[PDB]
């Protein structure tokens with residue numbers, strides 16, 4: 001109903017039908033069309049025709065370039081103001097701040113950014129009214145997980161960005177089948193605008209619409225809403241990637257008895273024809289995608305990839321921890337990707353791939369720092385800033401956060417159960433960080449409670465202090481930027497799994513690929529040689545007597561690690577445990593958990609801190 005002609009948006013639909021949508025999906029679409037005032041509404045069907053036509057359209061408006069060296073590959077170069085997730089403009093709205101972050105004892109919370117309902121309503125009203133004027137509102141119906149999966153969740157993303165539509169087609173399962181599957185079911189409401197209504201009030205840079213000053217990425221878990229304004233980039237705009245996958249899903253997980261985690265999932269098969277699935281949580285620049293797609297050096301071993309970023313895991317009636325990758329694609333960091341570091345990624349990204357902020361070769365190929373591949377005499381480079389570039393030039397040819405966005409189905413070692421609706425049974429969970437000193441190559445937690453403590457205690461060398469100097473920062477569970485709710489309550493949720501009847505608790509490990517000697521040289525060759533550490537984990541899960549007790553947990557026995565063909569590895573330095581180092585380490589973990597988790601620190605985590613202190617004290 002209406003007394004005039006401004007509420008019914010049927011006449012503006014250029015694909016699909018408002019009439020055909022489920023009731024609550026129509027209310028979401030039409031209500032936001034009323035608010036945002038798009039010129040057109042395009043209900044996405046997910047078809048190849050739709051996708052090809054949208055790429056060709058972006059190519060027409062100079063938003064993307066075709067990469068002529070490859071099969072159906074594309075390049076977007078952004079406004080340099082819009083190149084990454086912005087944590088300081090990423091917020092969660094709850095009635096009480098304590099539900100979102102623990103109230104710290106002394107300092108500012110680094111475990112999330114709470115925004116009041118009141119501040120959000122004012123921020124929303126200052127951004128969204130009229131924000132899509134002159135633009136198409138695309139309606140993206142998407143599944144996080146295989147369409148039928150009991151572990152899958154559905155979203156609807158409204159966006160004014162064709163780049164988001166194309167990228168969501170790769171990274172999620174989207175289109176008409178999702179609407180038909182959803183019916184009158186619950187879904188996560190995802191609203192996105194680049195925040196540049198036409199006619200443009202400000203200059204358009206590099207054909208990349210964004211509003212850096214008003215950039216705000218908001219999560220309202222109580223309303224099942226994600227509302228993102230002003231960035232067209234990655235984790236700010238692809239609302240499945242982090243906003244749904246980790247922040248909303250971790251809150252749903254808490255409510256519903258499951259886990260939404262920043263973990264790769266891989267399947268590993270040994271020479272005895274036994275296969276196990278492992279999950280691993282690493283912070284930035286620690287090589288998750290490299291591990292998830294490992295080419296093992298050990299003969300008779302096979303690694304296969306289920307996912308490189310997000311794991312949704314739920315203990316089933318039988319007690320198995322069943323995990324799905326809720327994504328449909330890999331959104332990998334391009335720099336440092338080489339035939340040496342990740343040959344399977346190199347194979348994956350040569351067709352049907354969208355690249356963002358990488359360099360382009362004159363023959364229509366891609367380039368970045370660490371590609372570790374020479375160009376034939378004659379081949380020149382255009383930087384990600386669309387300027388001629390030479391290897392001696394002092395700025396990088398690719399943005400350090402530049403990306404490939406590639407279908408998961410194209411990975412030559414994609415696991416045959418990567419889309420199984422039941423998920424895969426997780427037998428080990430691996431935590432890890434970049435630690436140039438003190439921390440052994442691998443250790444195993446003494447118990448589930450010790451393992452949750454090891455997660456909570458994760459630290460990693462930052463890319464910088466942000467002028468020259470290193471910082472060792474805390475990144476518990478690799479979730480510091482991604483917690484959907486109070487981290488103390490998340491620790492309690494993890495600890496509660498031990499009390500779930502029938503639960504088969506996976507073995508917990510911690511790895512450090514990055515330990516250095518006195519001269520700053522890596523003690524471990526890494527890459528495919530990491531298969532030797534996975535072999536040790538595999539045997540430990542089978543109950544092999546291959547461990548020695550230390551104050552930090554179990555490490556490999558003398559002669560337990562397969563070092564056949566590495567020549568002389570310095571195992572003594574690589575597994576060295578210094579009382580002085582670990583006294584300092586437990587003090588930093590104590591100060592951190594006391595301040596940042598404070599009243600919400602579970603008893604069992606404090607007990608694990610006391611126990612580690614006591615074991616170090618007896619060295």
Ligand SMILES: O=C(O)CSc1cccnc1C(=O)O
Pocket residue numbers: 083084085233234235236309331332401
């Ligand atoms: O900065 C961005 O928008 C992307 S951040 C990202 C992308 C893919 C997978 N993981 C991450 C992450 O920040 O952990």
Ligand SMILES: [Mn+2]
Pocket residue numbers: 061
């Ligand atoms: Mn046009």
Ligand SMILES: [Mn+2]
Pocket residue numbers: 262309
């Ligand atoms: Mn990630």
Ligand code: NA
Pocket residue numbers: 062063064076077078079205206207208
């Ligand atoms: Na551009």
